[PDB]
Design a protein around this ligand. Structure first.
Ligand SMILES: [Ca+2]
Ligand SMILES: [Ca+2]
Ligand SMILES: [Ca+2]
Length: 517
């Protein structure tokens, strides 16, 4: 027998109570219909489903543009002396970020150079380290980039790794780097910590060198209430829980505060668990959608499991005033969270446009709980990646999803093609308040697209940011690896179509199942 709340929602859904099984009835009687939202905004089960639906539709407003596949090359600077082996090798290059102006997010001009920090490593090896690259500011040629080498030096190992973050210019023209320090000494686990160091560079006759790395230290690795700690994860992980404490994005607000916006999972404030399946807030559709979703969740062990472990978070904390030796001043509740919905939302990024703050992130939809949604994405397109987006009136204020569901970009080609992309990272555009340039890496790692095909820098493309909290992808593309949009940067030749996006035979190529899930 249904309680009265369960009975209310069943009738509003326009389904007959007698058609419900005993297992279904007892599920509805567990439902918690009155949990007050924690601070911030959730990607709900309905939001996730709409994002995937939009991806399946391949609507030109949100689809990542087709890139002309003939044009795609390995990045010369990704052939470099490897941080671990100490030998010159052609490396995968993936997650990358430019040094930016801490206030505006514009790509910084350091003594006439643009500077990018990048994850690189040998395909099919555990080789995760970051490298500093440079080129003349405004230069548009992939091949003019040069690799200064690994920030943390040669003779490195997989026991201590560097994953992604951000970088800005300090007031004295040194660089403050935020990155992910990963310690794998505890049984090879990816123990992630947000770290920071100051980089001192020098410039001699067209060459930029890394003179010194100072003040390298851990900033934050979770508190337990707002964000999940390594100990918490380890306490309950049997192989189904993600661990995330990474991808820290530094930005300074109008009030002179530096913040980190970062990737994590929620803590005890609103923790993962089987109870989240029974928190009505997490669903976010009408009654009929919500009930159908509950029943689907319960009918599949995988989905139930995923829902039980899902609690991705985009966090924020305020740093203290020391530019070069940052520590946490205040922790806040996540800006965005996805309890029940996804256990992985990465590369959070904030861009200020006018008086608004746009929060973007990359995600692979196959890390969400709704297996039907992401498998349908894979079936329709051959990939499940997206960029999501929100907007707020202040850096810490309430973020509202863009384009209804939060969808911003959707995958347009199969994951194992040369022109597949991930790790979308938007950079503002000089003298434009309604556009950002979307950068990404191209070709998925570890040789999945074929012989000699390394992860490289994608051509970048403009995304228009509209005043009504929507976005529109524009048919404006650059060369590979362009971080700076201007009137010199357009290269319309790079834009492909559904056909030219593919090398010969890729349309009929066998799917890489491990890759797409
Ligand atoms: Ca060294
Ligand atoms: Ca989790
Ligand atoms: Ca450019």
């Amino acid at each position: 027998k249904l309680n009265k709340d369960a009975e209310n929602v069943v009738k509003k859904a326009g389904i007959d109570p007698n058609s419900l099984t005993d297992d279904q009835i007892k599920a509805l009687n567990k439902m918690n219909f009155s949990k007050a939202a924690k601070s911030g905004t959730q990607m709900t089960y309905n939001d996730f489903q709409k994002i995937a639906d939009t991806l399946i539709k391949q609507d030109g407003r949100y689809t990542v543009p087709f890139f002309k596949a003939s044009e795609i090359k390995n990045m010369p600077a990704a052939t470099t002396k490897d941080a671990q082996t100490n030998t010159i090798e052609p490396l995968d290059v993936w997650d990358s970020w430019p040094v930016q102006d801490v206030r505006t997010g514009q790509v910084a001009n350091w003594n006439g150079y643009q500077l990018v920090i990048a994850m690189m490593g040998i395909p099919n090896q555990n080789d995760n380290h970051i490298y500093l690259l440079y080129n003349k500011y405004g230069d548009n040629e992939l091949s003019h980039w040069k690799n200064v080498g690994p920030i943390f030096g040669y003779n490195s190992t997989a026991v201590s790794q560097e994953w992604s973050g951000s970088a800005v210019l300090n007031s004295d023209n040194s660089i403050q780097l935020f990155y992910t320090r990963v310690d794998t000494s505890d049984n090879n686990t990816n123990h992630q910590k947000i770290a920071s160091a100051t980089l001192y560079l020098t410039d001699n006759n067209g060459n930029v060198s890394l003179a010194q790395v100072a003040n390298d230290h851990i900033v934050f690795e979770g508190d337990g209430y707002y964000y999940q700690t390594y100990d918490q994860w380890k306490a309950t992980n049997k192989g189904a829980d993600n661990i995330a404490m990474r991808d820290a994005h530094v930005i300074e607000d109008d009030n002179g505060d530096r913040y980190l916006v970062f990737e994590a999972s929620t803590g005890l404030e609103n923790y993962q668990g089987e109870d989240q399946i029974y928190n009505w807030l997490n669903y976010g559709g009408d009654d009929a959608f919500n009930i159908k979703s509950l029943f689907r969740i319960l009918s599949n062990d995988d989905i139930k499991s995923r829902a039980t472990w899902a609690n991705a978070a985009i966090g924020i904390l305020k740093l203290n005033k020391d530019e070069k030796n940052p520590k946490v001043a205040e922790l806040y509740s996540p800006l965005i969270s996805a309890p029940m919905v996804s256990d992985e939302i990465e590369r959070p990024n904030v861009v200020k446009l006018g008086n608004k703050y746009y929060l973007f992130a990359a995600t692979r939809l196959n890390r969400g709980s709704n297996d039907d949604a992401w498998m349908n994405a894979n079936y329709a397109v051959g990939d499940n990646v997206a960029m999501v987006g929100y907007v707020a009136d202040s850096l810490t204020g309430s973020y509202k999803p863009l384009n209804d569901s939060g969808v911003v970009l959707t995958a347009s080609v199969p994951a194992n093609w040369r022109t597949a992309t991930y790790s979308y990272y938007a950079v503002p555009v000089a003298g434009k308040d309604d556009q950002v340039l979307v950068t990404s890496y191209m070709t998925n790692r570890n040789g999945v697209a074929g012989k000699g095909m390394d992860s490289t820098w994608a051509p970048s493309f403009l995304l228009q940011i509209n005043p009504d909290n929507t976005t529109t992808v524009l048919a404006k593309m650059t060369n590979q690896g362009d971080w700076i949009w201007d009137d010199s940067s357009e290269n319309l030749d790079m834009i492909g179509d559904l056909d030219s996006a593919a090398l010969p035979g890729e349309r009929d190529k066998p799917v890489d199942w491990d890759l797409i899930g």
